[PDB]
């Protein structure tokens, strides 16, 4: 449900600082980002909009899309 795909740089750097920024957001338990896949598995509290986290990543200067497939 809440696993997004990263596009604005997927390598092992952005897929880590994004995790940091994500985990810095209250309501986030774990941001399971995978660089060799380009996937962000967000373990957030229900209620936190997926598009909001995606927007947070977008506002982080990177690009992601809420796409569970
Ligand atoms: Hg990268």
* Domains, in order of start, for the chain: 1-69 (3.30.70.100)
Q: In what order do the strands lie in the sheet with 28-34?
A: 28-34, 39-44, 3-6, 64-65
- For residue 49, the CA-to-ligand 1 centroid distance in Å is 24
Query: Residue for token digits 């995978």?
Result: 34
In angstroms, what CA-CA distances link 35 with 19, 27, 48? Answer: 11, 23, 23
> According to the entry, how was the structure determined?
NMR
Contact between residue 59 and residue 11 where contact means Cβ atoms under 8 Å apart:
no
- Pairwise CA distance, residues 18 & 41, whole Å: 12
Between the CA of 16 and the centroid of ligand 1 the distance, in Å, is 9
Residues 53, 42: Cα–Cα separation, whole Å: 9
Element containing residue 44 per DSSP (H, E) = strand 39-44
Known binding site for a metal cation: residues? 11, 14
Q: How far apart are CA 61 and CA 59, in angstroms?
A: 5
Q: Are 44 and 29 in contact (CB under 8 A)?
A: yes
């Amino acid at each position: 449900m809440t696993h997004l795909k990263i596009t604005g740089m997927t390598c092992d750097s952005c897929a880590a600082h994004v995790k940091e920024a994500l985990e810095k957001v209250p309501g986030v338990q774990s941001a399971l980002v995978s660089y060799p896949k380009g996937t962000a598995q967000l373990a957030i509290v229900p209620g936190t909009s997926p598009d909001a986290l995606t927007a947070a990543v977008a506002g982080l200067g990177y690009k992601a899309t809420l796409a569970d497939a």
